[PDB]
Design a binder for this molecule. Structure first.
Ligand code: MET
Ligand code: K
Ligand code: K
Ligand code: K
Ligand code: K
Ligand code: K
Ligand code: K
Ligand code: K
Ligand code: K
Ligand code: K
Ligand code: K
Ligand code: K
Ligand code: MG
Ligand code: MG
Ligand code: MG
Ligand code: MG
Ligand code: MG
Ligand code: MG
Ligand code: MG
Ligand code: MG
Ligand code: MG
Ligand code: MG
Ligand code: MG
Ligand code: MG
Ligand code: MG
Ligand code: MG
Ligand code: MG
Ligand code: MG
Ligand code: MG
Ligand code: MG
Ligand code: MG
Ligand code: MG
Ligand code: MG
Ligand code: MG
Ligand code: MG
Ligand code: MG
Ligand code: MG
Ligand code: MG
Ligand code: MG
Ligand code: MG
Ligand code: MG
Ligand code: MG
Ligand code: MG
Ligand code: MG
Ligand code: MG
Ligand code: MG
Ligand code: MG
Ligand code: MG
Ligand code: MG
Ligand code: MG
Ligand code: MG
Ligand code: MG
Ligand code: MG
Ligand code: MG
Ligand code: MG
Ligand code: MG
Ligand code: MG
Ligand code: MG
Ligand code: MG
Ligand code: MG
Ligand code: MG
Ligand code: MG
Ligand code: MG
Ligand code: MG
Ligand code: MG
Ligand code: MG
Ligand code: MG
Ligand code: MG
Ligand code: MG
Ligand code: MG
Ligand code: MG
Ligand code: MG
Ligand code: MG
Ligand code: MG
Ligand code: MG
Ligand code: MG
Ligand code: MG
Ligand code: MG
Ligand code: MG
Ligand code: MG
Ligand code: MG
Ligand code: MG
Lengths: 97, 221, 124, 118, 152, 244, 205
RNA sequence: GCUAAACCUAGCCCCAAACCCACUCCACCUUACUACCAGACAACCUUAGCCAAACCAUUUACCCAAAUAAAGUAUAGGCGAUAGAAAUUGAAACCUGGCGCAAUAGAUAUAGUACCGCAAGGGAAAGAUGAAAAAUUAUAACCAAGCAUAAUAUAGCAAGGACUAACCCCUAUACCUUCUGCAUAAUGAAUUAACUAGAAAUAACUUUGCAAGGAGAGCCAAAGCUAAGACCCCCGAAACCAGACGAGCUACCUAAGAACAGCUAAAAGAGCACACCCGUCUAUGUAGCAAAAUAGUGGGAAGAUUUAUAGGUAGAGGCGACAAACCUA
RNA sequence: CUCCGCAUAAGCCUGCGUCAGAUUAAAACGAACUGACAAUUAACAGCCCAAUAUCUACAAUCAACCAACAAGUCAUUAUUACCCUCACUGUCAACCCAACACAGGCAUGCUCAUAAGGAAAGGUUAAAAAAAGUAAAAGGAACUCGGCAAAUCUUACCCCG
RNA sequence: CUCUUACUUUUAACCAGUGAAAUUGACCUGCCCGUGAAGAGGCGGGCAUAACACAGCAAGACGAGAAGACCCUAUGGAGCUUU
């Protein structure tokens, strides 16, 4: 029980597909391109996470500030509660003061 | 299961008939040898001509040798339970007869000698375009020595002996689907004459129970 | 304990509820004093059944019938087949005026007609 | 039932008869009145804030004198605005799942049949 | 007619007329004993007993003396695999009594004599199943289970 | 997921679709404009920069309006921009005491005003501020026309403005029909507020009122297809004759 | 008719049949079968077509297609790719063994050239008249669509009109004269029904 | 040997992109889903509180529409906890992706269905053959606990040292938690499978880069600066507040109904005593027939009686012949 | 045995009718389980009414004597308008509220012991303990907190209200 | 009650059918004395000791049940009263 009786289907990984072959290209666009474009401009994803890093509280604060007006009512309510809980956890609870 | 779902364009494709178009009754006392004759020959010739229409390169004289090879190879498939090859040698009417009773038994069948050359006794064909298909049945007389030794599920001797051949006189009926381009001559059934001698007795003893009478019922002579 | 999912029909409720709910059948009159029902003859629908004697059309059509393309009837086609020949005949004769549009079949108002197209006041 | 397909043919014949007759009446109604529907109606916003096509019913007194008709509410109060947004966002989530799932199926399909690149 | 808006009638107005009625009725065999002149119908819910009297006389030219109708409650006890109640549709039962002393008996729509065609059938599949079953014989007890295919 | 547009922009998007698209441009621009009301319940600083007394530094200052609640009954009068003040107070003006709820209500008076343009007297509920504004404007008619919409704070006041603007726009002769000289004198007095009649009809109307008015203007019976098909048939026959 | 479940698995038995209901009860939920999408115009296999089997025990053999299942890209060739099963089995009788065809994918069969009985690839092309037909790639020969019996089991040539079948002359007779009158108005004139009472105006809201 | 076990899909999550959605006929605000009759009833109105200040009473972050920076600075504050700008500065922006989940996961979802509640509301469980089932005598097997094949022989945390030998001999006071200290007769645990609990700044340290400079504007700098690595759990109250839903039970009331044999006295908030209402005492029952009953014995039974139907009073309240009663166990 | 029973109201909604099913009913092959087919037919009951003005002091109780207080369920007229007909809906059951095929709850009419409706014992044995009854020598509250319980059916007094 | 007894029914026990619940660390689950977190089937010294059902009993397993309601503690609540 809890373990499969047959081998799973084999994993076929194409190490030389277009995505892996051209991975990392243009990462030095600033260095080799007269600094016209920063490498952080290649990042694709959420508009509040392009070229920016932070903990859970900082991400929640930043997302609410940038796209809070575009969020759904239920999604926004959960985000507001998450910030309240994270504010109490980080600023009031922990081993170190 | 008797009939598929109604109102379907697709229909079951049968590869053989269910029986013999005209049963060939062998003459009495034929084993001792080992006007009407012309009428039977003329009827056979007409059916041969229709067979030669679908297959121009067909000879009646070569059939008994071809029939002998099919008969030997079909029974040799029972020894090793080679059902895949057996379907190509016997028809769908003959396959259940050969294999149903030996599924959990070991069969050791062998061919020793041919006492008398095989003779074609009857060649006949079905009515033209029964369902768009025309079938031709050829009956071959075989008088050969064979050895049979059947073992039960536990490997114990059940019928026959492995080293004593005996004379066998049987009339094997073959069938081919003329309309099918990929059809071939395959064993269809066997004809058992009423005057055929009884087979060898089995080894074990069998009890035949009497009627099972309810308490209200009574036994009668 | 009540079944909310079941359809609410006239078989449920007290005596007052059961007698007030109906099954969708249209009324054919009204109730006067003493609970006496007065059936209006005009409110009762009348079945206009034609004479079928000597009728050559049967419920089914023989399969030896040529296939024909489906061309739904539109207002433009109806106008051309019914009104265009009348207007063209008068146009060539030189006697055509907008005042005589009622001659060609135009109805300015549906009021005063037994069967009014809009709002519809007749059954199927 | 002996030959059940006879009933289907009759229903289709009568449905076609309704269609042909309705087309003649619809075409005639457009020529004489220009209305696209025989039964009058109007677009109304119900008490729940939804836009609905209210079919008009026949009465013997004007609408302002109708006690039962004037108890209905064909307007939405401000407290219904939030529920309209929640229902709108509910439809957005349902449509987003449907569109995203379709892209997942196509990617799975290409794995099974790699020759469909073209 | 059903699923239509009946034109409203005001005093002194025209007669209400229906030209292509969509009311469909089916003659049904009664489940209990009925008088010889009583004919039972299943009619739509929107159909009143007044309409059925005009329906039969107008279309079938059947003289009608009295009509009585009732509403039958379809069963709502069945449960599917989801434990969801399945509602058998409710139907209205109408009883019609003939006028001029006429009597009606429900005919036998499936006579046994007509259901048996004297003409033979030439189905290859049906014939093959029947022929093989008769041709093949049962096992002989004295053989003791030994296969009978072999001629030896 | 995320909305394509922010929620607060949904109202403005609705003005670009539906019947609101076909509203007059001059009316729509009036709704978009949101001027700051004249301060009533708070004293503006009057300067953009003030020197902070403590650090002696120049600090930017801003006027934050006090939120004002206008009861629905205020729309039937002329309160002059006043309204209820819903707020909190500290007991004995001490921040260490309790924070209590306090509501300040204007003192309402019933007064009768005569409008020269409308030639009618109205019994309007007003405050003492409304009297001062009318006195500073030298008449009710001047006060209604001069005061902007955001400062009137009254639906009745905007309705009075529309009535006066319509008469000035039309040079309506119903004002003193038997005294043409007197009628021209009053119109000459308020000629500076004259606007085209098309724009005057939409002054003071709410969004719902404007939509209903626009719907009535656009409400017309559909043209029967018989008349349309006649025009095409007649035109095509004439073109055929030219080719022959 | 029957609203099939979203992931119903089509099989050899037609949907809604007795066998299908037992195999596919209303509560069954199996893994969907990944089927390569083929457009209706791209599909080129029809009932009665002669195709050659490419894979299986009957590789290289040619037969006639008897059934096509578009939901599975299946073609059934009569008497080819067949396994044997017992039919009509009872408690006493072992049953009758019959060959049973197994479905073949569209990629496992190849249409044959009418001139030379060999498998060939085809493409859909339009003739001069504008009809869309199948053209062999290598030989450029038109492959006609096979004549298959209609699904309703009716032969127009071997058809006799019954007591309730309208004749061709009566069915195609045009008795409709266009006019600006409704069906109700024409019937009143036809049957001579006279109505002088006028319909009162009613309030719609 | 059974019971079971195993599976890969259904779909889902987070983003990008893009601004969604209403009506065949018929029915639907009255008791919704009800063909057909005198309306004139009509929307607006500061959130509170938990919580933090180790009590609490002023006070205690909550998208308000440009990423960054100015800056956690000015400033505010039981000048405590904590709150916190602006001028100014000024960038990028190619939907069709995944070091996301794979049936106790991922949405609650096969479904807001079954089921539960008068109502508001709460809210599931699960599926698995194959190319073909028109191949069903098919797709072998081995794997938890629980059993069966196969009950048991002096003696003892069940084991260890061993031994020719299972036991007999010798040695040995289960585990976790909690405590000065537990074999403790302190806590938790029948057992199996799955699920279930350490999130981050300030400096400092370590290892690279460059160096009086470091850093891809801001910032730091008397060897600094930039970048990386590395430290901060889970379940549980009684409560408080806001907005809804509840008087079909019960408390009392309103409208209009119903019941009360016989005997005594004949006048009766009178007596005896059925129906009926109540529940004094005893036994039985205590996972019961019953989340308050049964049997007997009792109180009342023409009255301040009992009772059917519809309506009313709603939680900062109602209602109360005050029992802190009763307001859906 | 008969605690009932029959019917209406209320509630429930096809929930022991037929056929085909051997699925179960706290046991059990009939069916309350499954599928299909049947059914409850209006006279009873529900669903009512043109306008305006106007009228309506004197209970009920066998309503007659009699005596009441708590002072009571039942009524029109005038003028105008109005010629028309029998629709629609409820109708079944062994049934509802209590998680149950609950010793519980449940309005009215009639029967007042039955014409209607029902079965306390699966079979056996006849131990203890326990439960429900009957009978008892002599004594008769010596029991016990107390005459609790049972039996019999009675006297006097006190406290509180 | 002295002072209990007899019989019947239910229960009971046995046979057949159907088939719960609290409980349960593992148990190969004795007595005496002593000891010990102070009251031992499990530790020390002795004694006893083939195995395993069924029916009774209620001295013990600090028996089961309910995170003691008594008491105290908490900068935990709540109702009520007030100069
Ligand atoms: C002392 O009396 C203590 N056991 C409290 C008794 S009442 C719960
Ligand atoms: K912390
Ligand atoms: K523990
Ligand atoms: K503890
Ligand atoms: K101890
Ligand atoms: K202890
Ligand atoms: K304890
Ligand atoms: K009970
Ligand atoms: K109430
Ligand atoms: K029921
Ligand atoms: K005795
Ligand atoms: K004990
Ligand atoms: Mg419910
Ligand atoms: Mg959904
Ligand atoms: Mg009826
Ligand atoms: Mg609806
Ligand atoms: Mg605090
Ligand atoms: Mg405290
Ligand atoms: Mg300070
Ligand atoms: Mg401090
Ligand atoms: Mg799930
Ligand atoms: Mg879904
Ligand atoms: Mg195991
Ligand atoms: Mg030992
Ligand atoms: Mg030891
Ligand atoms: Mg201690
Ligand atoms: Mg110790
Ligand atoms: Mg112990
Ligand atoms: Mg312990
Ligand atoms: Mg403890
Ligand atoms: Mg447990
Ligand atoms: Mg950390
Ligand atoms: Mg760290
Ligand atoms: Mg816990
Ligand atoms: Mg508080
Ligand atoms: Mg509150
Ligand atoms: Mg009540
Ligand atoms: Mg009252
Ligand atoms: Mg009495
Ligand atoms: Mg009394
Ligand atoms: Mg009671
Ligand atoms: Mg009482
Ligand atoms: Mg008494
Ligand atoms: Mg309320
Ligand atoms: Mg009371
Ligand atoms: Mg008291
Ligand atoms: Mg007290
Ligand atoms: Mg009854
Ligand atoms: Mg009833
Ligand atoms: Mg049934
Ligand atoms: Mg009925
Ligand atoms: Mg009646
Ligand atoms: Mg009845
Ligand atoms: Mg209960
Ligand atoms: Mg009961
Ligand atoms: Mg009886
Ligand atoms: Mg017994
Ligand atoms: Mg005893
Ligand atoms: Mg006793
Ligand atoms: Mg006694
Ligand atoms: Mg005695
Ligand atoms: Mg005494
Ligand atoms: Mg004593
Ligand atoms: Mg004593
Ligand atoms: Mg006593
Ligand atoms: Mg005393
Ligand atoms: Mg007293
Ligand atoms: Mg016992
Ligand atoms: Mg248990
Ligand atoms: Mg447990
Ligand atoms: Mg032992
Ligand atoms: Mg022992
Ligand atoms: Mg001791
Ligand atoms: Mg010892
Ligand atoms: Mg024992
Ligand atoms: Mg205990
Ligand atoms: Mg104890
Ligand atoms: Mg405790
Ligand atoms: Mg206490
Ligand atoms: Mg304390
Ligand atoms: Mg403390
Ligand atoms: Mg507190």
């Amino acid at each position: 029980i809890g373990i499969r009786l047959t081998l799973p289907p084999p994993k076929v990984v194409d190490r030389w597909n277009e995505k892996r072959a051209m991975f990392g290209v243009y990462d030095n666009i600033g260095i080799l391109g007269n600094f016209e474009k920063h490498p952080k401009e290649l990042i694709r994803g959420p508009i509040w996470l392009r070229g920016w890093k932070g903990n859970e509280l900082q991400r929640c604060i930043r997302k609410r500030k940038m796209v809070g007006s575009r969020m759904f009512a239920d999604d926004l309510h959960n985000l507001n509660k998450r910030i309240r809980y994270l504010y109490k956890h980080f600023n009031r609870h922990g081993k170190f003061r | 299961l008797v009939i598929p779902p109604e109102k379907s364009d697709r229909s079951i494709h049968l590869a053989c008939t269910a029986g013999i178009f005209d049963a060939y009754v062998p003459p009495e006392g034929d084993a001792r040898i080992s006007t009407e004759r012309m009428k039977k020959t003329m009827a056979s010739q007409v059916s041969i001509r229709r067979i030669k229409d679908y297959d121009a390169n067909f000879k009646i004289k070569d059939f008994p040798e071809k029939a002998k090879d099919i008969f030997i190879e079909a029974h040799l498939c029972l020894n090793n339970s080679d059902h895949d090859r057996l379907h190509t040698l016997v028809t769908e009417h003959c396959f259940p007869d050969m294999t149903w009773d030996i599924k959990y038994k070991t069969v050791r069948w062998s061919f020793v000698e041919s006492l008398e050359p095989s003779h074609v006794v009857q060649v006949r064909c079905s009515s033209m375009m029964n369902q768009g298909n025309v079938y031709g049945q050829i009956t071959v007389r075989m008088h050969t020595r064979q050895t049979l030794a059947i073992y039960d599920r536990f490997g114990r001797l059940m019928y026959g002996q492995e080293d004593v051949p005996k004379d066998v006189l049987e009339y094997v009926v073959f069938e081919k689907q003329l309309t099918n381009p990929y059809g071939s001559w395959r064993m269809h059934t066997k004809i058992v004459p009423p005057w055929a001698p009884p087979k060898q007795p089995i080894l074990k003893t069998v009890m035949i129970p009497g009627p099972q009478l309810k308490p209200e019922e009574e036994y009668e002579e | 304990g009540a079944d909310r999912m079941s359809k609410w029909t006239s078989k449920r409720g007290p005596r007052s509820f059961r007698g007030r709910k109906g099954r969708g059948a249209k009324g054919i009159g009204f109730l006067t004093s003493g609970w006496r029902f007065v059936q209006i003859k005009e409110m009762v629908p009348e079945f206009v059944v034609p004479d079928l004697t000597g009728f050559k059309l049967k419920p089914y059509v023989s399969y030896l019938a040529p296939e024909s393309e489906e061309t739904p009837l539109t207002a433009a086609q109806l106008f051309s087949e019914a009104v265009a020949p009348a207007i063209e005949k008068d146009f060539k004769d030189g006697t055509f005026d907008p005042d005589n549009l009622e001659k060609y079949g135009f109805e300015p108002t549906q009021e005063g007609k037994l069967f009014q197209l809009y709002p519809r006041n007749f059954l199927r | 039932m002996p030959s059940p397909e006879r009933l289907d043919k009759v229903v289709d014949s009568m449905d076609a008869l309704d269609k042909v007759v309705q087309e003649r009446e619809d075409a005639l109604r457009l020529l004489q009145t220009g209305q696209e529907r025989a039964r009058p109606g109007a677009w109304r916003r119900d008490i729940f804030g939804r836009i609905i096509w209210h079919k008009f019913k026949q009465w013997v007194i004007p609408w302002h004198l109708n006690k039962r008709y004037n108890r209905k509410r064909f307007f939405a109060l401000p407290y219904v605005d939030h529920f309209l947004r929640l229902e709108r966002e509910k439809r957005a989530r349902i449509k987003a799942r449907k569109e995203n799932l379709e892209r997942k199926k196509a990617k799975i399909l290409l794995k099974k049949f790699p020759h469909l690149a073209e | 007619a059903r699923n239509v808006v009946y034109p409203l009638y005001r005093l002194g107005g025209p007669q209400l007329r229906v030209f292509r009625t969509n009311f469909f009725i089916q003659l049904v065999r009664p489940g209990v004993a009925q008088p010889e002149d009583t004919v039972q119908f299943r009619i739509p819910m929107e159909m009143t007993r007044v309409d059925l009297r005009n329906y039969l006389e107008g279309i079938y030219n059947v003289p009608v003396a009295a009509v009585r109708t009732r509403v039958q409650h379809g069963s709502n006890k069945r449960r599917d695999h989801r434990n969801v109640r399945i509602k058998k549709p409710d139907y209205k039962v109408a009883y019609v009594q003939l006028a001029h002393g006429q009597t009606f008996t429900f005919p036998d729509l499936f006579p046994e004599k007509d259901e048996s065609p004297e003409g033979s059938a030439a189905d290859d599949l049906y014939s093959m199943l029947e022929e093989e079953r008769q041709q093949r014989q049962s096992s002989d007890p004295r053989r003791g289970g030994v296969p009978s295919w072999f001629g030896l | 997921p995320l909305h394509k547009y922010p929620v607060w922009l949904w109202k403005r998007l609705q003005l670009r679709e539906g019947i609101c698209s076909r509203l007059p441009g001059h009316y729509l621009r009036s709704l978009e404009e949101e001027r700051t009301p004249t301060p009533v319940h708070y004293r503006p600083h009057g300067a953009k920069f003030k020197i902070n007394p403590k650090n002696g530094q120049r600090e930017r200052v801003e006027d934050v309006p006090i939120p004002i609640y206008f009861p629905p009954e205020s729309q039937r009068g002329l309160w002059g921009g006043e309204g209820w003040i819903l707020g909190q107070i500290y007991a004995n003006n001490d921040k260490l005491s309790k924070r209590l709820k306090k509501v300040w209500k204007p003192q309402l008076f019933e007064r009768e005003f005569y409008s020269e343009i409308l030639d009618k007297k109205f019994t309007v509920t007003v405050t003492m501020r409304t009297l001062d504004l009318i006195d500073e404007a030298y008449g009710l008619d001047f006060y209604i026309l001069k005061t902007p919409k955001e400062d009137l704070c009254s639906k009745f006041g905007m309705d009075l403005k529309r009535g006066m603007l319509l008469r000035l726009a039309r040079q309506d002769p119903q004002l003193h029909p038997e005294d043409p000289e007197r009628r021209a004198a009053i119109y000459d007095k308020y000629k500076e507020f004259a606007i085209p009649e098309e724009e005057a009809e939409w002054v003071g109307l709410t969004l719902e009122e404007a939509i209903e008015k626009q719907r009535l203007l656009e409400e017309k019976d559909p043209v029967p297809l018989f008349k349309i098909y006649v025009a095409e048939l007649i035109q095509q026959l004439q073109q055929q004759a030219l080719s022959e | 008719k029957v609203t099939l479940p979203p992931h119903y698995r089509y099989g050899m038995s037609p949907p809604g049949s007795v066998a299908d209901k037992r195999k596919n009860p209303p509560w069954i939920r199996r893994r969907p079968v990944v089927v390569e999408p083929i457009s209706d115009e791209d599909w080129y296999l029809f009932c009665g077509d002669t195709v050659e089997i490419l894979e299986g025990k009957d590789a290289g053999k040619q037969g006639k297609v008897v059934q096509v299942i578009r939901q599975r890209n299946w073609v059934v060739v009569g008497g080819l790719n067949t396994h044997y099963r017992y039919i009509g089995k009872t408690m006493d009788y072992r049953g009758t063994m019959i060959p049973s065809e197994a479905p073949l994918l569209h990629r496992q069969v190849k249409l044959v050239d009418p001139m030379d009985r060999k498998p060939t690839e085809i493409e859909w092309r339009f003739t001069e008249a504008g009809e869309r037909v199948r053209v062999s790639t290598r030989s450029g020969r038109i492959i006609p669509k096979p004549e298959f019996p209609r699904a309703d089991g009716i032969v127009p040539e071997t058809w006799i009109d019954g007591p309730k079948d309208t004749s061709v002359e009566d069915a195609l007779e045009r008795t409709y004269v266009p006019c600006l009158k409704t069906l109700q108005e024409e019937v009143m004139e036809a049957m001579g029904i006279k109505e002088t009472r006028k319909y009162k105006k009613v309030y719609w809201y």
